[PDB]
Design a protein around this ligand. Structure first.
Ligand SMILES: CCCCCCCCCCCCC/C=C/[C@H](O)[C@H](N)CO
Lengths: 282, 245, 245, 40, 245
């Protein structure tokens, strides 16, 4: 070859089912060996242990680390939607956005990226909680599919769209939903704009909107041609299964205002801690 | 003697004599995209010297009541050099970064800066103050260019998340009695192997004074902060005419 | 890099970054009493953590005309902690010590302290001045407690013996340009294997400024001196009701 | 044993009947080796 | 830890704690004359301790507008000690040298000296100013003794050759922020194996402030410069009565 310059991770995983044992230690007097003095400017956490700062005994502990695994942290059904049919013509088209309730939103926004399968449960009743014999139909409308315009629309023929027929006196319906993003994970934070072009002030709503998370429309109706005399209230619950998560984030200390942006009330900034009077008196 | 360091890449060299370690973010070095992860079928271009080199931005001035600054990546370099021309002529880009922040002062000055990298730094507003307006940040705020922008409420990082747990991100400190520089090496982090350089920002760099600057009258009162950055494994694909934004 | 040191015993730790060596007095580490040297037949108690730990006394103030201070051992600890309770409930005691004296100042201060251990430090008086009175020192002078006392004539160490050959005893210096601490490890020294803790003092610790403290006006004028001590192999025997003195 | 923490001088003499001899020495120029600088 | 050094020769010792390396001029150590290079048939004398030792000359004062100083070798030592007596009683002499220049200041001073050895330093004049006089330097100028002389035009080194390429000669710097001493070891350089000590000077030592001395008012304004020299392999031959010049 005539041209010689054209010839040309740090850590690994380990299974830790229990917490770490403590070894016995004695006193230590000498120079040069100082495990208590650190340097926080390097960006590294402190590596000082119990046995280097005090005299310890031997503790064989069997405290399990299973519950803090992120599969056990997330596999709990939380509320994502409340849909009402008082919307007086017997059908609702609901655009799927699961960031409307603060408890599951703060848990998921601990991470930046997440990839999971879901399990949706549909708890339906009257607005006062009473149940009546009434037939309903839930339909998932993917993006691009025709959405229903009335109670007797042609889109309720559901020849390819997945649909569930259920009664109100039945147990709540459960379905499994796969991972269906065009990307490799869902992102709760998208720093940018979806399309090209000029970014004027009238189009500032486009900032932060990722189309890889937009999953379509969830439609409900009462099945018959005629109007039902019953009011409907549907509550949707979501379990997160088979989960992978990347890049932990600071947890939010401000109350949520809108579903699509991290906007916060600027006149009342909440402090993260509870205040006291003096630094010396607790 | 690990307080001295030298970073040489391309035709550029940074020397420092008062340093901490180098932080490698999430324990991963930047790499080119392998064949198993790629999806686009055209051959990408890798310029390898004209784009993988140190770039020095504008210089800030640390005052006694400074709030903090932020930059967006790779928005800081889309108009600079041969990197800024490859990012305009191509549709897709992929690269890691080596960030270096410089701030020196005398042995009679005091203060501490937190230099952190936060991926997908989405900004919020104060919602009109009362919380009733659905306001959105302007285009000069979300992508401020190589100049950068100032933080308005640094305690909530202008996004409703506290500064006190920003150290869960890859970070260093610049403590004026200890060191004068901070160095973080960042890999490529996205849900896609390639992305647009004009529409998407991967991470934000935050420089916030946690302990404020202090000195006695008669010492130097002009304490500047300089940011020097380098792409590492820059790839470009999807060649078409030049698009600025 | 032997200027840094860490002393950990019990539930206490001392760190220093500006140090000399550790002096081991007469080349001997403290030990428990062996069977060949013992005479008392009852089994002694060895608490081993609650008594073998670092104890911090009151703090002195180094002025520009200070004479010096002294402490008596183990009289400094007979009312402090679990060591002070074992010394009152038992008739016999035996232990070594680790003495640590701290004094820091800036790089614009100067001065030197001599920190020495003198076993059987018997004090004298000035004999009424003229030499005709057979005077004796009071009980607050011979056993001043954890507070300590001030030397009246430091040139003769209040005992008729010169300061200039006090360095024949185990000693260190605290030179303000060089180090900020001094550490001496003292074994048990007596003619008997056990003794009383309320009636007998084994050694005295002397801290005398040989070179006086000096600084310019505007620097910090409050330069304190702190003494931190630790028993090493404390044994107690002869259990009976509590006797304070 | 169920409890694991319950398992648990510098110089010597020499005969010197006479004082020490002196060895012959020459000049010495270099860095790093400074026997005249002490720390009292 | 190569900043510390100790030079011991004869009954003299120099210690330094803030030093650069030692320069060995042209990579050659001083030696005695071998039998192949010698021409004179009489046996030479080698005193070996009384002449090979460190000699300290007079002390200069570095002011804020100093031009520079020079010394001539071995003219500085022809009246000093046993070396000055062997150089007067003998006709031929041969030796190398170890030159050491000392200048210390605080950490708030600044300045830089160039310490160079120039063999066969022949001096010129200003030729009457206009260039028409064939003037010659006086005897006190060409051989100033152990006191030395001041340079009048240091930019041309009083010989028509520029200061800027004096570093082609064996040299060191005394930069006040870095070191306080400079050490050059010079071998014997001549066209003859032996020569006269009263008629011929082998080399000249030049100490010139390239960066001038600067400090603020209130610091020490008396910054002295001391030169200490040592013959290395001094030989003498041709014994006759004492001749001073
Ligand atoms: C008959 C079956 C109906 C159930 C259909 C459910 C499909 C929708 C599953 C979506 C999984 C979560 C996708 C992202 C949700 C969040 O709204 C986005 N991150 C918005 O930020």
């Amino acid at each position: 070859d005539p041209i010689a310059d054209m010839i040309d991770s740090l850590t690994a995983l380990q299974v830790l089912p229990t917490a770490a044992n403590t070894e016995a230690s004695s006193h230590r007097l000498g120079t040069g060996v100082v495990p208590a003095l650190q340097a926080a400017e390097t960006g590294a956490s402190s590596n000082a242990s119990d046995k280097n700062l005090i005299e310890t005994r031997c503790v064989l502990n069997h405290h399990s680390t299973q519950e803090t695994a992120i599969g056990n942290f997330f596999s709990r059904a939380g509320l994502v939607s409340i849909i009402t049919m008082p919307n007086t013509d017997g059908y609702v088209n609901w655009d799927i956005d699961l960031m409307g309730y603060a408890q599951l939103r703060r848990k998921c926004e601990l991470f930046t990226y997440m990839r999971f399968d879901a399990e949706f449960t549909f708890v339906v009743a009257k607005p006062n909680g009473v149940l009546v014999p009434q037939l309903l139909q839930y339909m998932y409308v993917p993006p691009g599919a025709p959405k229903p315009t009335s109670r007797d629309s042609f889109a309720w023929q559901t020849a390819t769209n997945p649909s569930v027929f259920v009664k109100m006196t039945d147990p709540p319906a459960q379905v499994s939903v796969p991972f269906m993003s065009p990307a490799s994970a869902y992102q709760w934070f998208y720093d940018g704009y979806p399309t090209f072009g000029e970014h004027l002030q009238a189009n500032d709503l486009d900032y932060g909107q990722c189309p890889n998370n937009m999953m379509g429309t969830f439609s409900i109706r009462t099945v018959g041609t005629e109007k039902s005399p019953h009011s409907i209230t549907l509550r949707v619950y979501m379990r997160i299964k088979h989960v992978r998560a990347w890049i932990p984030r600071p947890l939010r200390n401000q109350p949520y205002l809108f579903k699509t942006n991290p906007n916060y009330k600027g006149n009342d900034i909440k402090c993260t801690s509870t205040s006291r009077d003096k630094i010396t008196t607790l | 003697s690990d307080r001295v360091a030298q970073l040489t890449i391309g035709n550029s060299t940074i020397t420092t004599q008062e340093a901490a370690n180098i932080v490698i973010a999430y324990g991963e070095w930047p790499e080119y995209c392998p064949d198993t992860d790629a999806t686009a079928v055209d051959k990408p271009t890798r310029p390898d010297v004209s784009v993988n080199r140190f770039f020095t931005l504008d210089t800030k001035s640390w005052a006694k009541d400074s709030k903090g600054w932020y930059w967006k990546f790779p928005d800081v370099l889309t108009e600079v050099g041969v990197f800024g021309q490859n990012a305009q002529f191509h549709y897709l880009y992929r690269s890691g970064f080596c960030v270096h922040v410089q701030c020196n002062a005398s042995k009679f000055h005091q203060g501490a800066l937190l230099v952190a990298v936060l991926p997908e730094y989405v900004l919020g507003t104060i919602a009109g103050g009362t919380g009733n307006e659905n306001s959105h940040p302007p285009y000069a705020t979300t992508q401020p260019g190589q100049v950068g922008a100032v933080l308005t409420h640094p305690y909530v990082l202008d996004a409703g998340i506290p500064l006190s747990q920003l150290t869960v991100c890859p970070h260093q400190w610049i403590n004026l009695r200890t060191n004068n520089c901070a160095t973080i090496i960042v890999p490529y982090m996205n849900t896609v192997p390639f992305d647009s350089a004009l529409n998407h920002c991967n991470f934000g760099l935050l420089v916030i004074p946690v302990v404020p600057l202090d000195f006695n009258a008669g010492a130097t009162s002009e304490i500047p902060i300089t940011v020097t950055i380098a792409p590492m494994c820059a790839e470009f694909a999807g060649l078409r005419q030049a698009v600025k934004q």
